Symmetry: D2
Subunit: 237 residues, 4 copies
Amino acid sequence: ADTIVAVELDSYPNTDIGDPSYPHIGIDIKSIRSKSTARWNMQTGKVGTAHISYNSVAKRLSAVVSYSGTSSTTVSYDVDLNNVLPEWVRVGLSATTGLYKETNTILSWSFTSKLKTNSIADANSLHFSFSQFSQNPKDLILQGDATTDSDGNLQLTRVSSDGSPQGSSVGRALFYAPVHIWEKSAVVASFDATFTFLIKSPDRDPADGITFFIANTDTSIPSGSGGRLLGLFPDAN
Amino acid sequence: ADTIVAVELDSYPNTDIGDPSYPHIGIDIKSIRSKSTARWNMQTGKVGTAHISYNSVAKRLSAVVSYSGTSSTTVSYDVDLNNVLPEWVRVGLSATTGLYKETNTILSWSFTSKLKTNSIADANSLHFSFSQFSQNPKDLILQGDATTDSDGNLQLTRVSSDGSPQGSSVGRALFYAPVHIWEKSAVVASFDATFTFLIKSPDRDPADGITFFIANTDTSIPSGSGGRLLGLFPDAN
Amino acid sequence: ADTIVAVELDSYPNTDIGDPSYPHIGIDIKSIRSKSTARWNMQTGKVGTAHISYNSVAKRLSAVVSYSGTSSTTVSYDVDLNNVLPEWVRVGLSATTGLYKETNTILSWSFTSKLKTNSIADANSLHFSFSQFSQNPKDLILQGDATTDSDGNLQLTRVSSDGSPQGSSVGRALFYAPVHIWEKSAVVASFDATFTFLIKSPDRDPADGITFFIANTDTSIPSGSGGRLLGLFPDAN
Amino acid sequence: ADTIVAVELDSYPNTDIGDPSYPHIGIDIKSIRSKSTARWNMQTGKVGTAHISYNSVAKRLSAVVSYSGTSSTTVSYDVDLNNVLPEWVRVGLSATTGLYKETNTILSWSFTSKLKTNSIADANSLHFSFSQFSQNPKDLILQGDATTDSDGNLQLTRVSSDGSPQGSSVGRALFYAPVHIWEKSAVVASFDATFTFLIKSPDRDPADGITFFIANTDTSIPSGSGGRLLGLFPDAN
Ligand SMILES: OC[C@H]1O[C@H](Oc2c[nH]c3ccc(Br)c(Cl)c23)[C@@H](O)[C@@H](O)[C@@H]1O
Ligand SMILES: OC[C@H]1O[C@H](Oc2c[nH]c3ccc(Br)c(Cl)c23)[C@@H](O)[C@@H](O)[C@@H]1O
Ligand SMILES: OC[C@H]1O[C@H](Oc2c[nH]c3ccc(Br)c(Cl)c23)[C@@H](O)[C@@H](O)[C@@H]1O
Ligand SMILES: OC[C@H]1O[C@H](Oc2c[nH]c3ccc(Br)c(Cl)c23)[C@@H](O)[C@@H](O)[C@@H]1O
Ligand SMILES: [Ca+2]
Ligand SMILES: [Ca+2]
Ligand SMILES: [Ca+2]
Ligand SMILES: [Ca+2]
Ligand SMILES: [Mn+2]
Ligand SMILES: [Mn+2]
Ligand SMILES: [Mn+2]
Ligand SMILES: [Mn+2]
């Protein structure tokens, strides 16, 4: 199976697999059953922003999800990630719908990884930033239903020609190049990610959510990973 | 008095004011009596590197001090810094000698602060990097004995025309511009700093150390802050 | 007198001091009489963006001023800037009104300077970015009429409590720290600047314009520099 | 055939295909016959640094190649690159030996591309930096003889187990992800690259050189591109 570390923006509470009874953000370490969650007052139809950070000295994975003027939700978890993940990874965004649905629209996405040793000049860094997505994004690996649309946005899940979201959809976008997130001689390894998103829905209880995730480089959408599994895991273990 | 947050590279153990009985790195929150320390196997005559990081989501101030091939020391402390520090600050390096002495030579120094809201474009950022220091550094506020020398290095404490360190010395260097490290509407505030240093000494027990610190913008060397107080505090409370 | 290098967004044609007969952007080297200009179809009431770049290898100062979907104007000039400017400078924005008027509202401003030698790690860099301006910007030197307003914007020229622009106004904002833009041992020196602006006016022929400029560190608004002189020069020579 | 833009550090003068009669740096636009060259006093056995820059406003491709304390060579050429290159590219380093030989050792390599529109936040950016190369660089496409060695350096051309260079060698390293270097709606597109290199040789006239190049994403070493052709072109046209 894949090896998965993820920050989930979980719009739909699946209490039968350990979700809290409200929409939440969570930190997922090799399981959909989040190691840490926080209540998320998500705002359908508003543009939100997520910021995710980690470094190997502090060993604290943190995320904040915000809507201008409305709400800020933070979640953190203490974990040695470079003990969980392989040394080379790909990074990506995932999203799903299930019986219930929502758009999972990514408006922008940026990421920075640094592998330091003894200097101000790092041993390695990778930074990418997209504030719009081209119609043929050659630096993205699109998986499942993920497409880019005429407005330059990344639609992780299926939307109709009029933009209405569809159920039973899964899609992911990985950055094309592998990322060297740890190396035995590194003094410190860090990563930071930001994305902005727009979740719209006609459902009373929209679903299922969006994640930023880090995985083995050959990661692919698991069989049976739809809906509540957010396109990351094959089961709810 | 000034308001001080600092990471100390403390070369001399002053057990009578709460130092551990070995050279150590420490996190100092408004007191020379570190809130957290780690044993530091410091290598006289070798170039070392310090990396310091913090963000307001994780609320964990961490530092790693390293010598290539030799040693790595890490220390962390959980603290809401933007509750300790004013909204505007200056950032700097300090060093001292006392009865015992050492060079406190800074070879390079970089710093980044970010004040984010809802976007990939921050509300504010400041980044500076020096890999050498000019003879008249107009973007530094030099305090006490601090000078720049013919090799382009920053000598925080007094050195002879032949480079031999002198006792009873204190010096600091602040970046000229104030730094906006928090603002009530910020989603996240972060800072990162790196410097490389060279501590040489003919003393069996060199002293006193080097710090990276953050203070009120009008910070100045306190009266009586020499030696064990590292040019940051007026007393050992 | 001051030593001035500037990119002017000149909204008002003063043909009697060498302006073209249309609104224009220009490159100014120690004179309001631009060394190079380009016609600027400026859009009152729309947010524009300016990008300015230079490096000491290419020795070409270039600027592009754009309005989304509407227009793009470019101007360039071949010049050895590090032969014109002192080694230490301050960088800033200026604006004026005269008999005719306009708002000179800066919404965001960023700047990067790099002083390189033999490595990927530079000898020096400075980067700052403002996507909003605080009510008390301690890292800006405000000169003349320049203020920051309740929306977080920088108003270079005087505006009424209702936002109506006033005539006979001059204002500038400098970054607080001096910038080391050349050094004899540098392999390459570069700078880049971006700002976004909003010019509104009830006048048929708004005036006078906005500049990004680089000057001696002790630069101040010259006597008699109002209106057509854009707060940069004491005369039209 | 491939579409090639390159900066060549040409150590061996092949006057029969248009080289100057001395080692030189050159700007190559779809031909090994450089559009612009400069004399290069290359220093065998010393570490050199190359810096390359371009932006679509200035439309000037420039390079500087330097040895600390010894020499600086600059070359520039005015060209609309985004009229020469496809919209998506890969970027890389190449090197060759022929009858004569040299090591073509890359010690570090960094690259930044920016695709801007109306804001401080770009429409796209990609930045990578390597100050050492891992034994299995999963973010590099190694072509021909290129390998990474035990010191963490990139050896573009073949070297013996003792480090002696071999003749008749060609090797290239491309960054894994494609790069979006132009887009019709971009206000400005820019790129910058730096690498440091070490050329050693026992030959009186070492050969053949190192390039930084930009090409169609599916670029590969052309048949017959050895020696004087630097692994970039199939012929000397
Ligand atoms: O899209 C939201 C959810 O829809 C389905 O689960 C249900 C939500 N309400 C229900 C009511 C009945 C049944 Br049976 C199911 Cl399976 C559900 C499943 O597709 C879940 O994986 C998904 O999280
Ligand atoms: O430079 C190292 C130290 O030297 C002095 O303290 C002493 C170190 N060994 C001693 C022995 C005797 C006395 Br009395 C003192 Cl005050 C010291 C003081 O200057 C200390 O502040 C300083 O940390
Ligand atoms: O604000 C626009 C201009 O207004 C004044 O110049 C005039 C513009 N139209 C005029 C008509 C008459 C006279 Br007299 C003047 Cl001085 C002007 C002067 O203040 C100029 O410096 C300025 O560029
Ligand atoms: O490595 C340097 C050069 O060696 C060969 O060319 C020669 C350099 N000196 C010569 C002398 C004779 C002949 Br025949 C050749 Cl082909 C050469 C060829 O391999 C060239 O492509 C290459 O640039
Ligand atoms: Ca769920
Ligand atoms: Ca001590
Ligand atoms: Ca004018
Ligand atoms: Ca040649
Ligand atoms: Mn969940
Ligand atoms: Mn201590
Ligand atoms: Mn003009
Ligand atoms: Mn040549």
